[PDB]
Amino acid sequence: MNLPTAQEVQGLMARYIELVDVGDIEAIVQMYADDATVEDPFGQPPIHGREQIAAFYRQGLGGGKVRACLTGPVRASHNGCGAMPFRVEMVWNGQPCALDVIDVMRFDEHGRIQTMQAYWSEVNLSVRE
Amino acid sequence: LPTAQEVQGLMARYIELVDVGDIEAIVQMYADDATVEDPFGQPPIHGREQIAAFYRQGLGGGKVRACLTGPVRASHNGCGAMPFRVEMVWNGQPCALDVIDVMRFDEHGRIQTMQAYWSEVNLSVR
Ligand SMILES: C[C@]12CCc3c(ccc4cc(O)ccc34)[C@@H]1CCC2=O
Ligand SMILES: C[C@]12CCc3c(ccc4cc(O)ccc34)[C@@H]1CCC2=O
Ligand SMILES: [Cl-]
Ligand SMILES: [Cl-]
Ligand SMILES: [Mg+2]
Ligand SMILES: [Mg+2]
């Protein structure tokens, strides 16, 4: 594909969250441009290129015990970009938890993720109480 | 720069204000030389009077409601992003729209940039 249409951005970003959910790291990494960046969290130093991005998703996911679901619609532009609200479910201090996240993404004119920026800090982590 | 908890406060305070239609307090939350993109894909709007003409335009009828539809996500470098829904009338059709703003706050606590993510794919007749 060409540069994704708004409909195309909605479908690309929804598939990305299933991959994170199902932990299919190599498929995640194919969605990214070869020279992509990941800023996650946003505010931390960017991670360049597919080798560094695969290891990061291996770090983050490879241990298992992480479900990610959208909590609302993907918001898609007309310049290849979209934003999405989701929740991650995993393990913190041996007890389930949850991190509410928004990822923005900019795609390419080949339809691959050129950037990504994941918003969140500890204010968005919550636990049973 | 403002804290992650404080960003959850400035951004929520900004939807409060959209929701009741106070354009002058919305404009005061901004910086000098702020920019607005909105929608992200269109050139930026910059100037303080222009940023007012923009809120006057969208909002002015008194008939646009804004509410959050999830929590504000905030970073530790003075930035946040938020999901919300706008309801408005559009030439007699009752509609809705789904939106994500991303905002960065200067050290003075004012918006330095705002980028609003949405499209016509984010429109629904209610
Ligand atoms: C890595 C992680 C699980 C997945 C995840 C997190 C944060 C942001 C994310 C953004 C994504 O686009 C996909 C997955 C995550 C969590 C932070 C701590 C944790 O367990
Ligand atoms: C401008 C608008 C009402 C308000 C609004 C819209 C879109 C994005 C927004 C982002 C905001 O932070 C505050 C308000 C809006 C609508 C698009 C069409 C319309 O009538
Ligand atoms: Cl939402
Ligand atoms: Cl949400
Ligand atoms: Mg799944
Ligand atoms: Mg390229």
Residue with tokens 């050290």: B107
Beta bridge partners of A106: A81, A115
Residue B60 half-sphere exposure toward CB, CA atoms < 13 A: 7
Longest dimension (CA), chain A: 48
Nearest to A77 among B5, B41, B81 (CB): B41
Domains of chain A, by residue range, sit at: 1-129
Q: Which ligand is nearest to the CA of A16?
A: 1
DSSP 8-state assignment for residue B40: B
Distance CA B64, CA B97 (A): 11
Atom 18 of ligand 1: nearest residue by CA position: A60
Task: Report the b/e string of B75-112 with b at 16+ CB within 10 A.
Answer: bbbbbbbbbbbbebeeeeeeeebbbbbbbbbbeebebb
Identify the active-site residue in A32, A40, A57, A108.
Answer: A40
Q: Which atom of ligand 2 is nearest to the CA of B116?
A: 10
> Exposed, middle or buried: residue A5 (CB in 10 Å: 0-12, 13-18, 19+)?
middle
Going by their DSSP bridges, the two strands A125-126 and B30-37 should be labelled as unpaired
Q: Which of B11, B22, B51, B64 to mutate to test the pocket of ligand 2 (most atoms within 8 A of CB)?
A: B64
